[PDB]
């Protein structure tokens, strides 16, 4: 399954392999059983260019894992400003709450990230 390999390549940060897989028709919104998508992985692992190529090809900006977390939540946790901005440009929902009632703004406060809280 190409969708598994995409998730795999995205996690490892293989930007080229990500592009090759998508060209072969790999589902950009592929999921593991925890609802983790390539966009979740790219946001968490800080792979900016991969985040951008997934979103360009229609990655669900507001996909939720089994804890209700969006890529915006995960980007906020590690504090990747550029990914947060790119996610926001593609219509990421700042008001989205995980199953624990936390927003991306709430994570930025808990991490002590002043630069992220204002954005």
């Amino acid at each position: 399954d190409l969708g598994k390999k995409l998730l795999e390549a995205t996690r490892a940060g293989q930007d080229d392999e990500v592009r090759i897989l998508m060209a072969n028709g790999a589902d950009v919104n592929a999921m593991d059983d925890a609802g983790v998508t390539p966009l979740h992985l790219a946001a968490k692992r800080g792979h900016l260019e991969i985040v951008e190529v997934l979103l360009k090809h229609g990655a669900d900006v507001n996909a939720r894992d089994i804890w209700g977390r969006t890529p915006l939540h995960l980007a906020a946790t590690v504090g990747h400003l550029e990914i947060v901005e790119v996610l926001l440009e593609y219509g990421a929902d700042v008001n989205a709450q995980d199953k624990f009632g936390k927003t991306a703004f709430d994570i930025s406060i808990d991490n002590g990230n002043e630069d992220l809280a204002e954005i």
Partner: protein, 94 residues
Amino acid sequence: CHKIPVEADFLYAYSTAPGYYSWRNSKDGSWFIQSLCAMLKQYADKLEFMHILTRVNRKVATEFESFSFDATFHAKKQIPCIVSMLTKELYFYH
């Protein structure tokens, strides 16, 4: 006159223990319903219902483990939860 409780003769077969997430697979379905259907197909003519549900518990407990590219969600386990207010044995072949 003789009575029974209004809550008697209910069975609640939960996929998972109280407080826990319940795992599903996109192609095969949920772990619990897979196992329930498989155990009913194999044992509905052989075992009482509680014993069928116990095979389901073991099947879910031993044969399934989560796979996730996020370590937070990886290698997780699941036990179903049989809740019986039944007053009799249940055999589907009667």
